[model samples]
Target chain A: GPLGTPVPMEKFGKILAIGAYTGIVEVYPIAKAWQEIGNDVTTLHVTFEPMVILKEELEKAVTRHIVEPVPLNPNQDFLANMKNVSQRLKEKVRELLESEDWDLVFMVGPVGDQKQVFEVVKEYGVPMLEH
Target chain B: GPLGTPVPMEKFGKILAIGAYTGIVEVYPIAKAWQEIGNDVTTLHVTFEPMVILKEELEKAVTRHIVEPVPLNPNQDFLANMKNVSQRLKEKVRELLESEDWDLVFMVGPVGDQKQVFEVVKEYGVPML
Candidate 1:
């Protein structure tokens, strides 16, 4: 096999999170698993069920490396603003895919809410974990 | 819609874990939920599956915690180890229960292959979490 400088593929795995309310059960287990397997784990928070991520907890979870769009409620004002922001976020994520190839992407949310996220990411050949 | 202090409810929940292999599918969803609902979330690992806990991460998960006994494969040992360890652990736990009143005790593991972990924990009268 002419094995020379062995590549250290010591890090690799998948994380699939579901639901918004079941956070601890979700985040801790996946985080631990990724660490154990020697890979970095990132959690993406999303929900269609009116999930509100507290400022403090969101900061802790994302470690100040997240992009949060302005909060919008279709039932309230700013429908057009919501659409514009969502579109721009989608384009930015596309740029991210074209640039850095991540080891793993852990998606967290309900299945119905996450369908588009899954399809969009899968188009780039990234693994999608949905439990 | 009027309120004082709001009492800050929606900050309470429970977590139950079985086998340790199915983790990612387990941990993250629960964590996000806790944050969303405004409660502190904790994970306690106890398995007949020989689950290995990583450092720092364990600290991140559980706050000040309690014991989660290393479970025995009730079937592999015909539940003998469990019955024995459980019996001894039972006596020690009895001392605690008699000493103070606890609101909950969440015992976890496979439900008996043939018998139930719930039944074993029930002899003492502490409600399962």
Candidate 2:
């Protein structure tokens, strides 16, 4: 038996999705689903090192994407790396939000920079879906 | 660098997806994406044994599903099991294709009874993606 009936999106709208590390694996498939269903979708992917297959698959699936590193050396100090990522992520998120009107925002609990993302998304008053 | 921009599916339509063994793991997530975006989806899952987590997750994700076993004892004979499975799978696939209009058929290489599935899918003329 199935859990829930297929529910159509009420409206097709622009979506801002973010993911980090392996989080992109979880989010990309869903984003493609949204794209398949007729929505304008963009993703901000943050990872230490993006895999070759994932990069190709990501391109194949989602149209607008920003696959970025954490803006520091992968072998850097953990504390410094964490702090640097948070700072850069906050600014980048703010810039993206400021640049466009997003109907919905999506990220997951284990994704990169959720702390900063939540703050920015809340501040902008945009509805967010935490997958 | 990424490879391709997100391409929009031209039309959303009913999709018939089948998977077996761990193939459902790959297929389920993608199916959820299709389901989320707007197409009606149904999955026919055939496996020797479905994991507790996968079964729960499957029920959690997709709406219309038939999570079926191979219809025999797991500890049965392998050779006879293989032949019986192929026969039963062929009939079941025919029944499913006969029951509905499928815009697209999706399956994978190493799923259950692919030999039978390929035969029936070809006979029915539903395109596999």
Candidate 3:
């Protein structure tokens, strides 16, 4: 069997990055590095507040930028809404996976939030670099 | 004051990287990137097991590498020992701070382990990038 190894993480490829706002501090550098290396990068974030600064910074580096549920209702139960938000995140991941052949998936968030998303990624058998 | 913004993390400078083994997956790439950009990098880890491969890989990329408590006794209580080990980690960070004027300090671990270490870094007032 003659098969070449997948591109090293430093090389150019299509990259999918997913994270919650709290995880941004950790994921941003890695995702930014991928974009610098000529990868076609798409970043998806489920944000609670309007991170105008981060959204501006990320938009400069990635091919596509998405931040969800634009107007987070001020009166909503913060704890309860996270479950609903996490559900939305999983569905978005599934939708994105079906739309294109992503070469890599980078993720960081609550493990509970990521559980369902992981199954879909595995179902598609995409390699995920998780933290 | 014409102080240009501290050289962005992308440029070369003196870097002190400290983490527990569990954090290697998170810290390794950042440390390695610092090395690639010609920074004088020193990495210190407090480990419960010998990470031979990681030590080897890190050695090739940095100015100095140190991993501590070489032989973690299998006979002891794991939970009790971590507090003692964490205390040791604090002292190491303190000792390193005094030895040189580091440009940046990067750390990751249980917040309990890092509480004392954080105080010392603040005492020194070095930037944590």
Candidate 4:
């Protein structure tokens, strides 16, 4: 059984928008599901890695996958580059969270980073369900 | 700029799950985005057509996919079966909506049907934001 009683299905708008980071392979299904339901869905991808191959496969599904990568040099200050990328990614996410009305967010990396993003979503009073 | 002010990224739990029907091809990106953010996401696929080939490729993205199909024979009373399947799909979606606490839902089908599902989401007053 679900956490509570089921509501009537007519009161809610089925449009579900999502912001995603990391693991292109993992993002495919949730996006796929929303499209099947015939609602407007938008998915934004922010990452430090490039997923060209994954991008191609992702295109087959009905959802939109916007992939953004924060460039980094391995030989350079690895920690600094990571921090820089994280900041950039954070900014990108911030823009999405503000620019559009997202139904929920799906995160797939580290706990600390996820928590950071969660904080942003909370301001809008958006519920963050476990992916 | 967005419709509102930027939110501080420290208060919410970043996890997103979705339930879908029809147009499997379109569902990819939203599902993809959630996975990249390091949040736990689950997507359920409810469709009339089989997507075996597409399903194979979708597995690479590191997200969990559950595909449910409502078998319908075109020659058979199409309307009757559509209603039947829609009812079943509605039940399935209802289970997901109630079983877990969902923040918002992403609907991608027809307005009439979408509104039907929306009604269920509202009962919890989860905000569907």
Q: Highest TM-score among the candidates is held by which one?
A: 3
| Candidate 2 CA-lDDT value | 0.65
The TM-score measured for candidate 2 stands at 0.49
Taking the tens digit of each residue's C-alpha lDDT, what string does model 3 give over B1-129?
231112223443789887775665445555665665457888887767654237776776678877776456667787766766777787888889888889888776777766767888998988764
Q: Tell me the spans in candidate 4 whose CA falls farther than 4 Å from its real position.
A: A1-22, A49-53, B1-129
What lDDT tens digits, residue by residue, belong to model 1 across residues A1-131?
A: 12111111224543322223243334433343334434444444332234434434434433222333445557756556545444544454556567666645544444443565556678788765454
Residue A98 of model 3, lDDT score: 92
After superposition, candidate 2 runs with Cα above 4 Å error = A1-12, A49-53, A71-76, A109-112, B1-129
Q: Please give the range of 10 consecutive residues that has the lowest summed lDDT in model 2 chain A.
A: A1-10
Query: Is 2 or 3 the stronger prediction by TM-score?
Result: 3
lDDT of 4 at A84: 61
Q: Candidates' lDDT values, in order?
A: 0.41, 0.65, 0.69, 0.51
- Candidate 1 CAPRI assessment class: incorrect
Per residue, candidate 4 scores C-alpha lDDT tens digits across A2-121 of 221111111112333333344344444445444543445455555566433356654555456566666767778867765765676567667876777766555554565667767777
Candidate 4 chain A — worst ten consecutive residues by lDDT sum? A3-12
Residue A121 error, candidate 2, Å: 0.7
lDDT of candidate 2 over A1-88, digit per residue (tens): 2222122332348887677666666666666777654578787776654331266666666668887676556676867776765666
